Amino acid sequence: RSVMTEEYKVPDGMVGFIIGRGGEQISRIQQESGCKIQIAPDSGGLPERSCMLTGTPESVQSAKRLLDQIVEKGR
Amino acid sequence: QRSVMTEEYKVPDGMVGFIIGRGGEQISRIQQESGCKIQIAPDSGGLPERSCMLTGTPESVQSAKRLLDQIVEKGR
Amino acid sequence: QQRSVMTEEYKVPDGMVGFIIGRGGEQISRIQQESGCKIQIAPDSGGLPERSCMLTGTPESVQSAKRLLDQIVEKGR
């Protein structure tokens, strides 16, 4: 139940959508999950972009589900 | 020159939004690719160009200019 | 050491995080600029001795960042 940090991956082509205009989408996901979500700035041509998630295990799992939900809306 | 340096640079005012990209994802990426910090002023005050401050080694600063040009050359 | 930018997990001592970041974030801003590496630090270690970081850059930049971070840690408090 202590806070922990996990690596996670999102599609490079969805990063802009995940963050959203004015960062409003990533602010929503962090609030809804109780997780800090930090996204790397560059994939260097690879298909995924690394993220660091920090929260309780329950919050981290929630953040993964919410990120997946955004990706599943596509572009 | 080897050391990091800072200079002024200009981009078209009408390209600023495109350069930054949704969620700032494009400007974050081109800074990482070039090694150059790219700070863009918030307002042109009616002028056609927007001022930017570029900080990096000369090689990084040149790279950033090339990447910015390539974005501008895609237009809208 | 391939050419492309890559992302690595890395760790710094929890008790050094403030010193690494520096007053007004000036130190971490500078070492990122010097190394060419984005250095993202998690906000909380949850009682563990190390704090997770994500380093993004070319292999050469990532190694430079590790050296600069080690140099700061080796100055201690």
mmCIF file with all atom_site columns, C-alpha atoms in Angstrom:
data_model
loop_
_atom_site.group_PDB
_atom_site.id
_atom_site.type_symbol
_atom_site.label_atom_id
_atom_site.label_alt_id
_atom_site.label_comp_id
_atom_site.label_asym_id
_atom_site.label_entity_id
_atom_site.label_seq_id
_atom_site.pdbx_PDB_ins_code
_atom_site.Cartn_x
_atom_site.Cartn_y
_atom_site.Cartn_z
_atom_site.occupancy
_atom_site.B_iso_or_equiv
_atom_site.pdbx_formal_charge
_atom_site.auth_seq_id
_atom_site.auth_comp_id
_atom_site.auth_asym_id
_atom_site.auth_atom_id
_atom_site.pdbx_PDB_model_num
ATOM 1   C CA . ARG A 1 1  ? 0.000   0.000  0.000   1.00 0.00 ? 1  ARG A CA 1
ATOM 2   C CA . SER A 1 2  ? 3.004   2.466  0.052   1.00 0.00 ? 2  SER A CA 1
ATOM 3   C CA . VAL A 1 3  ? 3.497   4.687  -2.993  1.00 0.00 ? 3  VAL A CA 1
ATOM 4   C CA . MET A 1 4  ? 5.684   3.072  -5.689  1.00 0.00 ? 4  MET A CA 1
ATOM 5   C CA . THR A 1 5  ? 6.998   3.905  -9.124  1.00 0.00 ? 5  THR A CA 1
ATOM 6   C CA . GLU A 1 6  ? 6.410   1.832  -12.282 1.00 0.00 ? 6  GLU A CA 1
ATOM 7   C CA . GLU A 1 7  ? 7.601   2.164  -15.880 1.00 0.00 ? 7  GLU A CA 1
ATOM 8   C CA . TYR A 1 8  ? 4.873   2.045  -18.484 1.00 0.00 ? 8  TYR A CA 1
ATOM 9   C CA . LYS A 1 9  ? 4.590   2.505  -22.286 1.00 0.00 ? 9  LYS A CA 1
ATOM 10  C CA . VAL A 1 10 ? 2.235   4.393  -24.569 1.00 0.00 ? 10 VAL A CA 1
ATOM 11  C CA . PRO A 1 11 ? 2.201   4.625  -28.359 1.00 0.00 ? 11 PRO A CA 1
ATOM 12  C CA . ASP A 1 12 ? 4.470   7.382  -29.560 1.00 0.00 ? 12 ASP A CA 1
ATOM 13  C CA . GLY A 1 13 ? 1.722   8.657  -31.916 1.00 0.00 ? 13 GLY A CA 1
ATOM 14  C CA . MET A 1 14 ? -0.769  9.054  -29.012 1.00 0.00 ? 14 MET A CA 1
ATOM 15  C CA . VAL A 1 15 ? 1.443   11.156 -26.708 1.00 0.00 ? 15 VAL A CA 1
ATOM 16  C CA . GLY A 1 16 ? 0.021   14.496 -27.869 1.00 0.00 ? 16 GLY A CA 1
ATOM 17  C CA . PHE A 1 17 ? -3.571  13.196 -27.404 1.00 0.00 ? 17 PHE A CA 1
ATOM 18  C CA . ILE A 1 18 ? -2.782  11.785 -23.989 1.00 0.00 ? 18 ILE A CA 1
ATOM 19  C CA . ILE A 1 19 ? -1.353  15.071 -22.780 1.00 0.00 ? 19 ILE A CA 1
ATOM 20  C CA . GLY A 1 20 ? -4.049  17.007 -24.631 1.00 0.00 ? 20 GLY A CA 1
ATOM 21  C CA . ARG A 1 21 ? -4.500  20.641 -25.432 1.00 0.00 ? 21 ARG A CA 1
ATOM 22  C CA . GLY A 1 22 ? -3.187  22.675 -22.505 1.00 0.00 ? 22 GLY A CA 1
ATOM 23  C CA . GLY A 1 23 ? -2.244  19.424 -20.740 1.00 0.00 ? 23 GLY A CA 1
ATOM 24  C CA . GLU A 1 24 ? -5.911  19.099 -19.689 1.00 0.00 ? 24 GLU A CA 1
ATOM 25  C CA . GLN A 1 25 ? -6.213  15.382 -20.531 1.00 0.00 ? 25 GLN A CA 1
ATOM 26  C CA . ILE A 1 26 ? -3.120  14.283 -18.555 1.00 0.00 ? 26 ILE A CA 1
ATOM 27  C CA . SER A 1 27 ? -4.224  16.508 -15.649 1.00 0.00 ? 27 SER A CA 1
ATOM 28  C CA . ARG A 1 28 ? -7.618  14.635 -15.700 1.00 0.00 ? 28 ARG A CA 1
ATOM 29  C CA . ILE A 1 29 ? -6.018  11.187 -15.790 1.00 0.00 ? 29 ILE A CA 1
ATOM 30  C CA . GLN A 1 30 ? -3.686  12.005 -12.897 1.00 0.00 ? 30 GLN A CA 1
ATOM 31  C CA . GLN A 1 31 ? -6.585  13.360 -10.837 1.00 0.00 ? 31 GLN A CA 1
ATOM 32  C CA . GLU A 1 32 ? -8.897  10.454 -11.583 1.00 0.00 ? 32 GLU A CA 1
ATOM 33  C CA . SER A 1 33 ? -6.245  7.816  -10.786 1.00 0.00 ? 33 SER A CA 1
ATOM 34  C CA . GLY A 1 34 ? -4.335  9.408  -7.918  1.00 0.00 ? 34 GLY A CA 1
ATOM 35  C CA . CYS A 1 35 ? -1.127  8.821  -9.879  1.00 0.00 ? 35 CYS A CA 1
ATOM 36  C CA . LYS A 1 36 ? 1.734   11.137 -11.032 1.00 0.00 ? 36 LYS A CA 1
ATOM 37  C CA . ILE A 1 37 ? 2.319   10.394 -14.747 1.00 0.00 ? 37 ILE A CA 1
ATOM 38  C CA . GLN A 1 38 ? 5.588   11.566 -16.293 1.00 0.00 ? 38 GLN A CA 1
ATOM 39  C CA . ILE A 1 39 ? 6.156   11.028 -20.024 1.00 0.00 ? 39 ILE A CA 1
ATOM 40  C CA . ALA A 1 40 ? 9.554   10.958 -21.751 1.00 0.00 ? 40 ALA A CA 1
ATOM 41  C CA . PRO A 1 41 ? 10.023  13.667 -24.417 1.00 0.00 ? 41 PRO A CA 1
ATOM 42  C CA . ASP A 1 42 ? 11.189  11.529 -27.380 1.00 0.00 ? 42 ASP A CA 1
ATOM 43  C CA . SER A 1 43 ? 10.960  7.901  -28.576 1.00 0.00 ? 43 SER A CA 1
ATOM 44  C CA . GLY A 1 44 ? 13.930  8.183  -30.971 1.00 0.00 ? 44 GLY A CA 1
ATOM 45  C CA . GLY A 1 45 ? 12.000  6.416  -33.743 1.00 0.00 ? 45 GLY A CA 1
ATOM 46  C CA . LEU A 1 46 ? 10.697  3.559  -31.542 1.00 0.00 ? 46 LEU A CA 1
ATOM 47  C CA . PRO A 1 47 ? 6.964   2.820  -31.551 1.00 0.00 ? 47 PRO A CA 1
ATOM 48  C CA . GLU A 1 48 ? 6.435   3.332  -27.792 1.00 0.00 ? 48 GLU A CA 1
ATOM 49  C CA . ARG A 1 49 ? 7.146   6.252  -25.462 1.00 0.00 ? 49 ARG A CA 1
ATOM 50  C CA . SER A 1 50 ? 8.213   5.519  -21.871 1.00 0.00 ? 50 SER A CA 1
ATOM 51  C CA . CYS A 1 51 ? 6.199   6.828  -18.925 1.00 0.00 ? 51 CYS A CA 1
ATOM 52  C CA . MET A 1 52 ? 6.855   6.755  -15.190 1.00 0.00 ? 52 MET A CA 1
ATOM 53  C CA . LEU A 1 53 ? 3.854   6.247  -12.923 1.00 0.00 ? 53 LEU A CA 1
ATOM 54  C CA . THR A 1 54 ? 4.043   7.059  -9.216  1.00 0.00 ? 54 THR A CA 1
ATOM 55  C CA . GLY A 1 55 ? 1.302   6.212  -6.745  1.00 0.00 ? 55 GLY A CA 1
ATOM 56  C CA . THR A 1 56 ? -0.099  3.423  -4.596  1.00 0.00 ? 56 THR A CA 1
ATOM 57  C CA . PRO A 1 57 ? -0.471  0.089  -6.471  1.00 0.00 ? 57 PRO A CA 1
ATOM 58  C CA . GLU A 1 58 ? -4.168  0.663  -6.792  1.00 0.00 ? 58 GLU A CA 1
ATOM 59  C CA . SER A 1 59 ? -3.578  4.153  -8.272  1.00 0.00 ? 59 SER A CA 1
ATOM 60  C CA . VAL A 1 60 ? -0.923  2.884  -10.676 1.00 0.00 ? 60 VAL A CA 1
ATOM 61  C CA . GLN A 1 61 ? -3.293  0.188  -11.971 1.00 0.00 ? 61 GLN A CA 1
ATOM 62  C CA . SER A 1 62 ? -6.043  2.779  -12.322 1.00 0.00 ? 62 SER A CA 1
ATOM 63  C CA . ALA A 1 63 ? -3.735  5.061  -14.322 1.00 0.00 ? 63 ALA A CA 1
ATOM 64  C CA . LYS A 1 64 ? -2.877  2.199  -16.709 1.00 0.00 ? 64 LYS A CA 1
ATOM 65  C CA . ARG A 1 65 ? -6.606  1.543  -17.302 1.00 0.00 ? 65 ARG A CA 1
ATOM 66  C CA . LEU A 1 66 ? -7.308  5.244  -17.948 1.00 0.00 ? 66 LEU A CA 1
ATOM 67  C CA . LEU A 1 67 ? -4.352  5.658  -20.298 1.00 0.00 ? 67 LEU A CA 1
ATOM 68  C CA . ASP A 1 68 ? -5.580  2.561  -22.204 1.00 0.00 ? 68 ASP A CA 1
ATOM 69  C CA . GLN A 1 69 ? -9.068  4.133  -22.430 1.00 0.00 ? 69 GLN A CA 1
ATOM 70  C CA . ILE A 1 70 ? -7.607  7.287  -24.029 1.00 0.00 ? 70 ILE A CA 1
ATOM 71  C CA . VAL A 1 71 ? -5.511  5.227  -26.481 1.00 0.00 ? 71 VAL A CA 1
ATOM 72  C CA . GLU A 1 72 ? -8.605  3.195  -27.393 1.00 0.00 ? 72 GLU A CA 1
ATOM 73  C CA . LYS A 1 73 ? -10.336 6.405  -28.558 1.00 0.00 ? 73 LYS A CA 1
ATOM 74  C CA . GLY A 1 74 ? -7.475  6.802  -31.072 1.00 0.00 ? 74 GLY A CA 1
ATOM 75  C CA . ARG A 1 75 ? -7.247  9.906  -33.277 1.00 0.00 ? 75 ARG A CA 1
ATOM 76  C CA . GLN B 2 1  ? 33.059  26.795 -30.062 1.00 0.00 ? 1  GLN B CA 1
ATOM 77  C CA . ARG B 2 2  ? 32.598  23.989 -27.555 1.00 0.00 ? 2  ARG B CA 1
ATOM 78  C CA . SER B 2 3  ? 30.599  25.704 -24.762 1.00 0.00 ? 3  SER B CA 1
ATOM 79  C CA . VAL B 2 4  ? 26.862  26.087 -24.484 1.00 0.00 ? 4  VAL B CA 1
ATOM 80  C CA . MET B 2 5  ? 25.706  29.540 -25.652 1.00 0.00 ? 5  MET B CA 1
ATOM 81  C CA . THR B 2 6  ? 22.436  31.405 -25.968 1.00 0.00 ? 6  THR B CA 1
ATOM 82  C CA . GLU B 2 7  ? 21.033  33.265 -28.891 1.00 0.00 ? 7  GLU B CA 1
ATOM 83  C CA . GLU B 2 8  ? 17.913  34.909 -30.210 1.00 0.00 ? 8  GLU B CA 1
ATOM 84  C CA . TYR B 2 9  ? 16.049  33.387 -33.138 1.00 0.00 ? 9  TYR B CA 1
ATOM 85  C CA . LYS B 2 10 ? 12.741  34.018 -34.987 1.00 0.00 ? 10 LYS B CA 1
ATOM 86  C CA . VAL B 2 11 ? 9.867   31.836 -36.210 1.00 0.00 ? 11 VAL B CA 1
ATOM 87  C CA . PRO B 2 12 ? 6.724   32.894 -38.076 1.00 0.00 ? 12 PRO B CA 1
ATOM 88  C CA . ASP B 2 13 ? 4.034   33.955 -35.642 1.00 0.00 ? 13 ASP B CA 1
ATOM 89  C CA . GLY B 2 14 ? 1.470   31.817 -37.513 1.00 0.00 ? 14 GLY B CA 1
ATOM 90  C CA . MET B 2 15 ? 3.597   28.662 -37.107 1.00 0.00 ? 15 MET B CA 1
ATOM 91  C CA . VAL B 2 16 ? 4.090   28.893 -33.321 1.00 0.00 ? 16 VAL B CA 1
ATOM 92  C CA . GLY B 2 17 ? 1.117   26.617 -32.477 1.00 0.00 ? 17 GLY B CA 1
ATOM 93  C CA . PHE B 2 18 ? 2.256   24.006 -35.031 1.00 0.00 ? 18 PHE B CA 1
ATOM 94  C CA . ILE B 2 19 ? 5.815   24.117 -33.754 1.00 0.00 ? 19 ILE B CA 1
ATOM 95  C CA . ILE B 2 20 ? 4.754   23.567 -30.127 1.00 0.00 ? 20 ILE B CA 1
ATOM 96  C CA . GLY B 2 21 ? 2.262   20.859 -31.057 1.00 0.00 ? 21 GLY B CA 1
ATOM 97  C CA . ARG B 2 22 ? -0.598  19.314 -29.076 1.00 0.00 ? 22 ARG B CA 1
ATOM 98  C CA . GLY B 2 23 ? 0.410   19.139 -25.434 1.00 0.00 ? 23 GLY B CA 1
ATOM 99  C CA . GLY B 2 24 ? 3.778   20.628 -26.334 1.00 0.00 ? 24 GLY B CA 1
ATOM 100 C CA . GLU B 2 25 ? 4.807   17.204 -27.648 1.00 0.00 ? 25 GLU B CA 1
ATOM 101 C CA . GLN B 2 26 ? 6.563   18.513 -30.779 1.00 0.00 ? 26 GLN B CA 1
ATOM 102 C CA . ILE B 2 27 ? 8.680   21.192 -29.097 1.00 0.00 ? 27 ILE B CA 1
ATOM 103 C CA . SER B 2 28 ? 9.614   18.691 -26.325 1.00 0.00 ? 28 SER B CA 1
ATOM 104 C CA . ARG B 2 29 ? 10.784  16.202 -28.975 1.00 0.00 ? 29 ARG B CA 1
ATOM 105 C CA . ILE B 2 30 ? 12.788  18.648 -31.124 1.00 0.00 ? 30 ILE B CA 1
ATOM 106 C CA . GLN B 2 31 ? 14.561  19.999 -28.020 1.00 0.00 ? 31 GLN B CA 1
ATOM 107 C CA . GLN B 2 32 ? 15.551  16.424 -27.143 1.00 0.00 ? 32 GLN B CA 1
ATOM 108 C CA . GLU B 2 33 ? 16.648  15.629 -30.729 1.00 0.00 ? 33 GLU B CA 1
ATOM 109 C CA . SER B 2 34 ? 18.747  18.807 -31.088 1.00 0.00 ? 34 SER B CA 1
ATOM 110 C CA . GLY B 2 35 ? 20.113  19.190 -27.541 1.00 0.00 ? 35 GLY B CA 1
ATOM 111 C CA . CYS B 2 36 ? 18.869  22.762 -27.634 1.00 0.00 ? 36 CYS B CA 1
ATOM 112 C CA . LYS B 2 37 ? 16.573  24.461 -25.184 1.00 0.00 ? 37 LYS B CA 1
ATOM 113 C CA . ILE B 2 38 ? 14.002  26.378 -27.270 1.00 0.00 ? 38 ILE B CA 1
ATOM 114 C CA . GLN B 2 39 ? 12.047  29.020 -25.394 1.00 0.00 ? 39 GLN B CA 1
ATOM 115 C CA . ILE B 2 40 ? 9.374   30.838 -27.365 1.00 0.00 ? 40 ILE B CA 1
ATOM 116 C CA . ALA B 2 41 ? 8.003   34.234 -26.446 1.00 0.00 ? 41 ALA B CA 1
ATOM 117 C CA . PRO B 2 42 ? 4.240   34.309 -25.720 1.00 0.00 ? 42 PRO B CA 1
ATOM 118 C CA . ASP B 2 43 ? 3.213   37.193 -28.028 1.00 0.00 ? 43 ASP B CA 1
ATOM 119 C CA . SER B 2 44 ? 4.505   38.936 -31.204 1.00 0.00 ? 44 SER B CA 1
ATOM 120 C CA . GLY B 2 45 ? 2.629   42.182 -30.481 1.00 0.00 ? 45 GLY B CA 1
ATOM 121 C CA . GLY B 2 46 ? 1.321   42.248 -34.079 1.00 0.00 ? 46 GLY B CA 1
ATOM 122 C CA . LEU B 2 47 ? 4.691   41.543 -35.745 1.00 0.00 ? 47 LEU B CA 1
ATOM 123 C CA . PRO B 2 48 ? 5.015   38.714 -38.293 1.00 0.00 ? 48 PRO B CA 1
ATOM 124 C CA . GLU B 2 49 ? 7.778   36.867 -36.386 1.00 0.00 ? 49 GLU B CA 1
ATOM 125 C CA . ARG B 2 50 ? 7.891   35.488 -32.853 1.00 0.00 ? 50 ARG B CA 1
ATOM 126 C CA . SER B 2 51 ? 11.127  35.663 -30.854 1.00 0.00 ? 51 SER B CA 1
ATOM 127 C CA . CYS B 2 52 ? 12.729  32.486 -29.526 1.00 0.00 ? 52 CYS B CA 1
ATOM 128 C CA . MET B 2 53 ? 15.775  31.973 -27.257 1.00 0.00 ? 53 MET B CA 1
ATOM 129 C CA . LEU B 2 54 ? 17.962  28.992 -28.166 1.00 0.00 ? 54 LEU B CA 1
ATOM 130 C CA . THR B 2 55 ? 20.482  27.618 -25.679 1.00 0.00 ? 55 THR B CA 1
ATOM 131 C CA . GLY B 2 56 ? 22.973  24.905 -26.543 1.00 0.00 ? 56 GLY B CA 1
ATOM 132 C CA . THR B 2 57 ? 26.338  24.165 -28.065 1.00 0.00 ? 57 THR B CA 1
ATOM 133 C CA . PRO B 2 58 ? 26.764  25.692 -31.540 1.00 0.00 ? 58 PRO B CA 1
ATOM 134 C CA . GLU B 2 59 ? 26.139  22.250 -33.042 1.00 0.00 ? 59 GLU B CA 1
ATOM 135 C CA . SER B 2 60 ? 22.872  21.893 -31.030 1.00 0.00 ? 60 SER B CA 1
ATOM 136 C CA . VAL B 2 61 ? 21.725  25.407 -31.915 1.00 0.00 ? 61 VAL B CA 1
ATOM 137 C CA . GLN B 2 62 ? 22.270  24.709 -35.635 1.00 0.00 ? 62 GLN B CA 1
ATOM 138 C CA . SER B 2 63 ? 20.403  21.418 -35.344 1.00 0.00 ? 63 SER B CA 1
ATOM 139 C CA . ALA B 2 64 ? 17.481  23.168 -33.701 1.00 0.00 ? 64 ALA B CA 1
ATOM 140 C CA . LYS B 2 65 ? 17.331  25.770 -36.502 1.00 0.00 ? 65 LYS B CA 1
ATOM 141 C CA . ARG B 2 66 ? 17.256  22.948 -39.101 1.00 0.00 ? 66 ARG B CA 1
ATOM 142 C CA . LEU B 2 67 ? 14.457  21.110 -37.264 1.00 0.00 ? 67 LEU B CA 1
ATOM 143 C CA . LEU B 2 68 ? 12.420  24.292 -36.830 1.00 0.00 ? 68 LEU B CA 1
ATOM 144 C CA . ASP B 2 69 ? 12.856  25.111 -40.543 1.00 0.00 ? 69 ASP B CA 1
ATOM 145 C CA . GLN B 2 70 ? 11.707  21.637 -41.534 1.00 0.00 ? 70 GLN B CA 1
ATOM 146 C CA . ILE B 2 71 ? 8.492   22.123 -39.450 1.00 0.00 ? 71 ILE B CA 1
ATOM 147 C CA . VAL B 2 72 ? 7.912   25.572 -40.980 1.00 0.00 ? 72 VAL B CA 1
ATOM 148 C CA . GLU B 2 73 ? 8.458   24.126 -44.483 1.00 0.00 ? 73 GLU B CA 1
ATOM 149 C CA . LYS B 2 74 ? 5.560   21.722 -43.941 1.00 0.00 ? 74 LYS B CA 1
ATOM 150 C CA . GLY B 2 75 ? 3.326   24.785 -43.358 1.00 0.00 ? 75 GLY B CA 1
ATOM 151 C CA . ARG B 2 76 ? -0.270  23.968 -42.376 1.00 0.00 ? 76 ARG B CA 1
ATOM 152 C CA . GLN C 3 1  ? 26.083  3.085  -28.041 1.00 0.00 ? 1  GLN C CA 1
ATOM 153 C CA . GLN C 3 2  ? 23.678  3.317  -30.994 1.00 0.00 ? 2  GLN C CA 1
ATOM 154 C CA . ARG C 3 3  ? 22.867  6.759  -32.415 1.00 0.00 ? 3  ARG C CA 1
ATOM 155 C CA . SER C 3 4  ? 19.158  7.188  -31.603 1.00 0.00 ? 4  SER C CA 1
ATOM 156 C CA . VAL C 3 5  ? 17.678  8.748  -28.482 1.00 0.00 ? 5  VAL C CA 1
ATOM 157 C CA . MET C 3 6  ? 16.576  6.130  -25.911 1.00 0.00 ? 6  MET C CA 1
ATOM 158 C CA . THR C 3 7  ? 15.000  6.086  -22.458 1.00 0.00 ? 7  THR C CA 1
ATOM 159 C CA . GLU C 3 8  ? 16.478  4.388  -19.372 1.00 0.00 ? 8  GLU C CA 1
ATOM 160 C CA . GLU C 3 9  ? 15.277  3.999  -15.771 1.00 0.00 ? 9  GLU C CA 1
ATOM 161 C CA . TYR C 3 10 ? 17.865  5.155  -13.288 1.00 0.00 ? 10 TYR C CA 1
ATOM 162 C CA . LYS C 3 11 ? 18.069  5.676  -9.504  1.00 0.00 ? 11 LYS C CA 1
ATOM 163 C CA . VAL C 3 12 ? 19.406  8.409  -7.234  1.00 0.00 ? 12 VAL C CA 1
ATOM 164 C CA . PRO C 3 13 ? 19.470  8.483  -3.450  1.00 0.00 ? 13 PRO C CA 1
ATOM 165 C CA . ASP C 3 14 ? 16.211  9.795  -2.048  1.00 0.00 ? 14 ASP C CA 1
ATOM 166 C CA . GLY C 3 15 ? 18.115  12.112 0.316   1.00 0.00 ? 15 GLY C CA 1
ATOM 167 C CA . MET C 3 16 ? 20.046  13.698 -2.594  1.00 0.00 ? 16 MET C CA 1
ATOM 168 C CA . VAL C 3 17 ? 17.040  14.632 -4.749  1.00 0.00 ? 17 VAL C CA 1
ATOM 169 C CA . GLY C 3 18 ? 16.756  18.206 -3.390  1.00 0.00 ? 18 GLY C CA 1
ATOM 170 C CA . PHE C 3 19 ? 20.498  18.818 -3.839  1.00 0.00 ? 19 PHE C CA 1
ATOM 171 C CA . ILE C 3 20 ? 20.377  17.448 -7.358  1.00 0.00 ? 20 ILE C CA 1
ATOM 172 C CA . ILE C 3 21 ? 17.476  19.697 -8.372  1.00 0.00 ? 21 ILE C CA 1
ATOM 173 C CA . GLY C 3 22 ? 19.029  22.723 -6.682  1.00 0.00 ? 22 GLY C CA 1
ATOM 174 C CA . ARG C 3 23 ? 17.612  26.112 -5.760  1.00 0.00 ? 23 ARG C CA 1
ATOM 175 C CA . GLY C 3 24 ? 14.891  27.058 -8.213  1.00 0.00 ? 24 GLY C CA 1
ATOM 176 C CA . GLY C 3 25 ? 15.685  23.896 -10.187 1.00 0.00 ? 25 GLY C CA 1
ATOM 177 C CA . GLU C 3 26 ? 18.791  25.612 -11.510 1.00 0.00 ? 26 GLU C CA 1
ATOM 178 C CA . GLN C 3 27 ? 21.119  22.628 -11.093 1.00 0.00 ? 27 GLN C CA 1
ATOM 179 C CA . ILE C 3 28 ? 18.933  20.029 -12.815 1.00 0.00 ? 28 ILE C CA 1
ATOM 180 C CA . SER C 3 29 ? 18.207  22.526 -15.648 1.00 0.00 ? 29 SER C CA 1
ATOM 181 C CA . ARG C 3 30 ? 21.928  23.033 -16.155 1.00 0.00 ? 30 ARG C CA 1
ATOM 182 C CA . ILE C 3 31 ? 22.981  19.366 -16.056 1.00 0.00 ? 31 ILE C CA 1
ATOM 183 C CA . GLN C 3 32 ? 20.235  18.456 -18.546 1.00 0.00 ? 32 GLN C CA 1
ATOM 184 C CA . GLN C 3 33 ? 21.559  21.154 -20.883 1.00 0.00 ? 33 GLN C CA 1
ATOM 185 C CA . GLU C 3 34 ? 25.194  20.057 -20.377 1.00 0.00 ? 34 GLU C CA 1
ATOM 186 C CA . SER C 3 35 ? 24.494  16.321 -20.931 1.00 0.00 ? 35 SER C CA 1
ATOM 187 C CA . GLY C 3 36 ? 21.775  16.541 -23.612 1.00 0.00 ? 36 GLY C CA 1
ATOM 188 C CA . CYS C 3 37 ? 19.699  14.238 -21.411 1.00 0.00 ? 37 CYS C CA 1
ATOM 189 C CA . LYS C 3 38 ? 16.200  14.819 -20.132 1.00 0.00 ? 38 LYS C CA 1
ATOM 190 C CA . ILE C 3 39 ? 16.223  13.811 -16.440 1.00 0.00 ? 39 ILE C CA 1
ATOM 191 C CA . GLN C 3 40 ? 12.782  13.229 -14.951 1.00 0.00 ? 40 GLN C CA 1
ATOM 192 C CA . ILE C 3 41 ? 12.626  12.441 -11.280 1.00 0.00 ? 41 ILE C CA 1
ATOM 193 C CA . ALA C 3 42 ? 9.711   10.749 -9.552  1.00 0.00 ? 42 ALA C CA 1
ATOM 194 C CA . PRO C 3 43 ? 8.128   12.810 -6.726  1.00 0.00 ? 43 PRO C CA 1
ATOM 195 C CA . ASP C 3 44 ? 8.242   10.225 -3.914  1.00 0.00 ? 44 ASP C CA 1
ATOM 196 C CA . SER C 3 45 ? 10.246  7.110  -2.986  1.00 0.00 ? 45 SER C CA 1
ATOM 197 C CA . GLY C 3 46 ? 7.536   5.725  -0.667  1.00 0.00 ? 46 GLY C CA 1
ATOM 198 C CA . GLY C 3 47 ? 10.050  5.024  2.102   1.00 0.00 ? 47 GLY C CA 1
ATOM 199 C CA . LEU C 3 48 ? 12.627  3.348  -0.170  1.00 0.00 ? 48 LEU C CA 1
ATOM 200 C CA . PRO C 3 49 ? 16.239  4.577  -0.163  1.00 0.00 ? 49 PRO C CA 1
ATOM 201 C CA . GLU C 3 50 ? 16.350  5.344  -3.904  1.00 0.00 ? 50 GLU C CA 1
ATOM 202 C CA . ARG C 3 51 ? 14.220  7.628  -6.070  1.00 0.00 ? 51 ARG C CA 1
ATOM 203 C CA . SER C 3 52 ? 13.384  6.518  -9.622  1.00 0.00 ? 52 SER C CA 1
ATOM 204 C CA . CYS C 3 53 ? 14.442  8.701  -12.529 1.00 0.00 ? 53 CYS C CA 1
ATOM 205 C CA . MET C 3 54 ? 13.855  8.424  -16.248 1.00 0.00 ? 54 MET C CA 1
ATOM 206 C CA . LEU C 3 55 ? 16.749  9.473  -18.473 1.00 0.00 ? 55 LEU C CA 1
ATOM 207 C CA . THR C 3 56 ? 16.113  10.210 -22.152 1.00 0.00 ? 56 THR C CA 1
ATOM 208 C CA . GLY C 3 57 ? 18.868  10.896 -24.659 1.00 0.00 ? 57 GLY C CA 1
ATOM 209 C CA . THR C 3 58 ? 21.430  9.355  -26.960 1.00 0.00 ? 58 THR C CA 1
ATOM 210 C CA . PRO C 3 59 ? 23.592  6.732  -25.242 1.00 0.00 ? 59 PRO C CA 1
ATOM 211 C CA . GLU C 3 60 ? 26.410  9.281  -25.051 1.00 0.00 ? 60 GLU C CA 1
ATOM 212 C CA . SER C 3 61 ? 24.062  11.834 -23.402 1.00 0.00 ? 61 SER C CA 1
ATOM 213 C CA . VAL C 3 62 ? 22.651  9.267  -20.968 1.00 0.00 ? 62 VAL C CA 1
ATOM 214 C CA . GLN C 3 63 ? 26.193  8.296  -19.880 1.00 0.00 ? 63 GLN C CA 1
ATOM 215 C CA . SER C 3 64 ? 27.127  11.959 -19.496 1.00 0.00 ? 64 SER C CA 1
ATOM 216 C CA . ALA C 3 65 ? 24.079  12.529 -17.312 1.00 0.00 ? 65 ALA C CA 1
ATOM 217 C CA . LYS C 3 66 ? 24.961  9.533  -15.078 1.00 0.00 ? 66 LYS C CA 1
ATOM 218 C CA . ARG C 3 67 ? 28.495  10.941 -14.615 1.00 0.00 ? 67 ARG C CA 1
ATOM 219 C CA . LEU C 3 68 ? 27.197  14.425 -13.748 1.00 0.00 ? 68 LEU C CA 1
ATOM 220 C CA . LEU C 3 69 ? 24.633  13.007 -11.312 1.00 0.00 ? 69 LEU C CA 1
ATOM 221 C CA . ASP C 3 70 ? 27.309  10.812 -9.639  1.00 0.00 ? 70 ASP C CA 1
ATOM 222 C CA . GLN C 3 71 ? 29.568  13.865 -9.262  1.00 0.00 ? 71 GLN C CA 1
ATOM 223 C CA . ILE C 3 72 ? 26.765  15.742 -7.464  1.00 0.00 ? 72 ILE C CA 1
ATOM 224 C CA . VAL C 3 73 ? 25.999  12.725 -5.205  1.00 0.00 ? 73 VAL C CA 1
ATOM 225 C CA . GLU C 3 74 ? 29.721  12.404 -4.390  1.00 0.00 ? 74 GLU C CA 1
ATOM 226 C CA . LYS C 3 75 ? 29.706  15.941 -2.983  1.00 0.00 ? 75 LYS C CA 1
ATOM 227 C CA . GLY C 3 76 ? 27.025  14.756 -0.502  1.00 0.00 ? 76 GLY C CA 1
ATOM 228 C CA . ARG C 3 77 ? 25.392  17.281 1.855   1.00 0.00 ? 77 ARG C CA 1
#
